[PDB]
């Protein structure tokens, strides 16, 4: 689940939407999806649900790029899918590059202890996956 504050760039509109705003108003919009091929494809949202308030961790990546998600949220690492609570300053994550638009790999900058905030839930067509804070991790 994604925490409030996470930005979501839409390929259809080309702007930046906030999950807190997209879910609260279940807005029929689109998002970027990822497959096992590593390629990015736009996909519509067909479900919006609130996950309640729970503890979440903050993953800081080089460039300031940060992502807040639940410990059960799986992150796309070099070794497949790994729970966020299993990430330590040294784990590399895939982040979308606006320069080449293509997928790129970067190292973490610092791990942020658990906190507390509202969390949301989405459903991307079938390719359960969405781009959040430039980072690609299951919905």
XYZ file of C-alpha atoms in Angstrom:
139
model
C 0.000 0.000 0.000
C 1.178 3.546 -0.736
C 1.203 6.307 1.890
C -0.116 9.851 1.419
C 2.341 12.237 -0.262
C 3.425 9.767 -2.942
C 3.347 11.477 -6.348
C 1.967 9.661 -9.392
C 2.849 10.777 -12.920
C 0.138 9.833 -15.438
C 1.149 8.949 -19.071
C -2.278 9.886 -20.475
C -2.504 13.353 -18.917
C 1.245 13.764 -18.532
C 0.823 15.608 -15.204
C 1.435 14.644 -11.553
C -1.420 13.259 -9.455
C -1.405 12.545 -5.709
C -2.598 9.114 -4.572
C -4.449 10.753 -1.671
C -6.420 12.783 -4.207
C -6.751 10.026 -6.820
C -8.097 7.437 -4.391
C -10.287 9.684 -2.257
C -12.089 10.744 -5.419
C -11.649 7.365 -7.203
C -10.763 9.330 -10.326
C -10.945 7.207 -13.541
C -7.315 7.977 -14.548
C -4.279 6.112 -15.914
C -0.858 5.170 -14.559
C 2.370 3.550 -15.758
C 2.552 -0.250 -15.469
C 5.557 -2.593 -15.519
C 5.939 -6.194 -16.702
C 8.643 -8.854 -16.287
C 10.143 -7.513 -19.507
C 11.116 -4.320 -17.675
C 9.169 -2.182 -20.157
C 6.686 0.478 -19.101
C 3.105 0.539 -20.410
C 0.181 2.804 -19.502
C -2.821 1.150 -17.822
C -6.184 2.430 -16.424
C -7.243 2.126 -12.786
C -10.363 0.092 -12.083
C -10.397 -0.032 -8.284
C -9.721 2.401 -5.413
C -9.656 1.480 -1.712
C -8.393 3.003 1.515
C -6.070 0.738 3.513
C -6.370 2.702 6.781
C -3.540 4.097 8.917
C -0.512 1.856 9.375
C 3.224 1.984 9.947
C 5.297 2.720 6.835
C 8.997 3.111 5.979
C 10.658 5.785 3.839
C 13.145 4.802 1.143
C 15.460 7.626 0.085
C 17.195 7.184 -3.286
C 19.941 9.297 -4.849
C 18.556 12.592 -6.192
C 16.143 13.139 -3.278
C 13.652 10.735 -4.792
C 11.751 9.148 -1.906
C 8.955 6.609 -1.518
C 6.753 5.849 1.492
C 5.089 2.418 1.565
C 4.097 -0.321 4.022
C 6.640 -2.991 5.170
C 4.530 -5.549 3.273
C 4.811 -3.517 0.088
C 7.028 -5.408 -2.374
C 9.807 -3.431 -4.045
C 11.245 -4.379 -7.421
C 14.876 -5.133 -6.562
C 17.663 -6.645 -8.657
C 16.693 -10.038 -7.225
C 12.966 -9.857 -7.969
C 10.365 -8.820 -5.414
C 11.384 -8.003 -1.841
C 9.293 -6.644 1.033
C 10.098 -3.042 1.895
C 10.817 -3.939 5.532
C 13.708 -5.973 4.093
C 15.490 -2.962 2.582
C 18.728 -1.572 4.008
C 21.021 1.258 2.910
C 22.692 -0.741 0.140
C 19.796 -2.325 -1.758
C 19.464 -1.129 -5.340
C 16.028 -0.265 -6.725
C 14.815 0.455 -10.240
C 13.716 4.059 -10.885
C 12.286 5.548 -14.084
C 14.586 8.078 -15.790
C 12.853 11.094 -17.307
C 15.977 11.748 -19.369
C 15.926 8.527 -21.408
C 12.415 7.624 -20.254
C 13.889 4.160 -19.902
C 14.329 2.146 -16.734
C 17.499 2.768 -14.737
C 19.142 1.294 -11.645
C 20.338 3.380 -8.666
C 21.487 2.797 -5.068
C 19.643 3.776 -1.898
C 20.702 6.874 0.024
C 19.285 6.297 3.514
C 16.609 4.169 5.218
C 13.940 6.027 7.256
C 12.546 4.314 10.458
C 8.883 3.313 10.539
C 6.268 6.045 10.982
C 2.494 6.421 10.763
C 0.166 7.628 8.010
C -2.839 6.817 5.849
C -2.336 4.179 3.139
C -4.238 3.580 -0.097
C -4.730 0.744 -2.549
C -5.177 0.587 -6.324
C -5.641 -2.052 -9.023
C -3.837 -1.701 -12.344
C -5.717 -3.638 -15.068
C -3.834 -6.931 -14.769
C -0.189 -5.956 -14.597
C -0.374 -5.272 -10.898
C 2.349 -2.617 -10.781
C 2.595 1.155 -10.850
C 5.158 3.947 -10.956
C 5.390 5.882 -7.702
C 7.943 8.580 -6.919
C 9.857 7.586 -10.027
C 10.222 4.163 -8.352
C 8.492 1.038 -9.713
C 6.839 -1.221 -7.116
C 3.707 -3.409 -7.100
C 0.460 -1.509 -6.438
